[PDB]
């Protein structure tokens, strides 16, 4: 699996599984771009913003940013401490490090501004300037994780071709995601 | 043998385990001390999530290793 219902919120297990699928696809079709790219585990992305600097530096060592051109971080607003606050929203941070002097973290949030506080924390930990980037806004209460996953896949397609990072025209498909995870 | 589980806040949980212990067994041991149900836990070692069915020895986790605990996410 893990399988996903028609209106089910995505968990970290769904996001990580699609990121593993994508990581394997990219290393097959574009191994050079795949070596330059990190699809960061959502749990490791939360560790990156930990108030414990020893936990954050461990997470940094797993991400290996110093050799990456692009970091894709799913951003959850789950609490660091409260077992009963496991998150309400997913957004996407793409950190472009190609210019090692002006790294930028593009924040794609399908509810604009929702996760901006956490996005700024992550960008600071990654030595990037935060910039809100356009993505189609969600039209229901359950698809933010699908925006994160399909936005990631669309950005990967655009990075392979030379560019346009405007995701206002993003078309998402929960159906295609459920098929990917179920197969 | 002794292993350590590090929390997102940097707190250290000390567990007593065997190499034959499954990851699920380890999560139960965390529940025994912290009260967190296993279904909420994820355990990470060397950047990889640990599957409930494998043992510590499967992942080459040896005495005094540190694992990282991150609770499940949803959105």
Numbering used by the authors:
A (entry chain A): 828 to 989, 991 to 1011
B (entry chain B): 1 to 75
Copied sentences from the primary study:
NopD, an effector protein from rhizobia involved in legume nodule symbiosis, exhibits deSUMOylation activity and, unexpectedly, also deubiquitination and deNeddylation activities. Structural predictions indicate that the 1017 residue full-length protein of the Bradyrhizobium NopD symbiotic effector consists of a long N-terminal extension, which based on the Alphafold-2 model is formed by a combination of disordered regions and small helical globular domains, followed by a globular C-terminal protease domain with homology with the CE clan of cysteine proteases. The active site catalytic triad seems already formed in the absence of SUMO or ubiquitin substrate, as inferred by the distances between the catalytic triad residues (Cys971, His916 and Asp936) between our complex structures with the AlphaFold-2 model, suggesting that NopD might be active in the absence of a UbL substrate, as initially observed in human SENP233, and does not require any substrate-induced activation mechanism. So, it seems that rhizobia NopD has evolved to gain deconjugation activities for SUMO, ubiquitin, and Nedd8, in a single catalytic domain by the acquisition of a “Loop insert” sequence and the maintenance of key “hot spots” in the interface that are essential for the proteolytic activity of each UbL.
Here, we present two crystal structures of Bradyrhizobium (sp. XS1150) NopD complexed with either Arabidopsis SUMO2 or ubiquitin at 1.50 Å and 1.94 Å resolution, respectively. The C-terminal carboxylate group of SUMO2-PA or ubiquitin-PA can thus be crosslinked with the active site cysteine of NopD (Cys971) to form a stable covalent product complex after incubating NopD with either SUMO2-PA or ubiquitin-PA. Our structural studies uncover that in contrast to Xanthomonas XopD, NopD shares the same binding interface for ubiquitin as it does for SUMO. Thus, in the NopD complex, a different interface is formed compared to XopD, as indicated by a ubiquitin displacement of approximately 5–6 Å when superimposing both complexes. In ubiquitin, Trp889 is located in a pocket formed by Ile44, Gly47, and His68 (all distances around 3.5 Å); whereas in AtSUMO2, Trp889 is located in a similar pocket formed by Leu60, Gly63, and Asp84 (all distances around 3.5 Å). Another interesting feature in the NopD-ubiquitin structure is the presence of a strong well-oriented electrostatic interaction between ubiquitin’s C-terminal Arg72 and NopD Glu840. Glu840 is a unique trait in NopD essential for binding to ubiquitin, as observed in the complex structure engaged to ubiquitin’s Arg72. This interaction is not present in complex with SUMO, and cannot take place in complex with Nedd8, in which Arg72 is replaced by an alanine. Notably, our functional analysis indicated that the NopD E840A point mutant is only relevant for ubiquitin, in contrast to AtSUMO2 or AtNedd8.
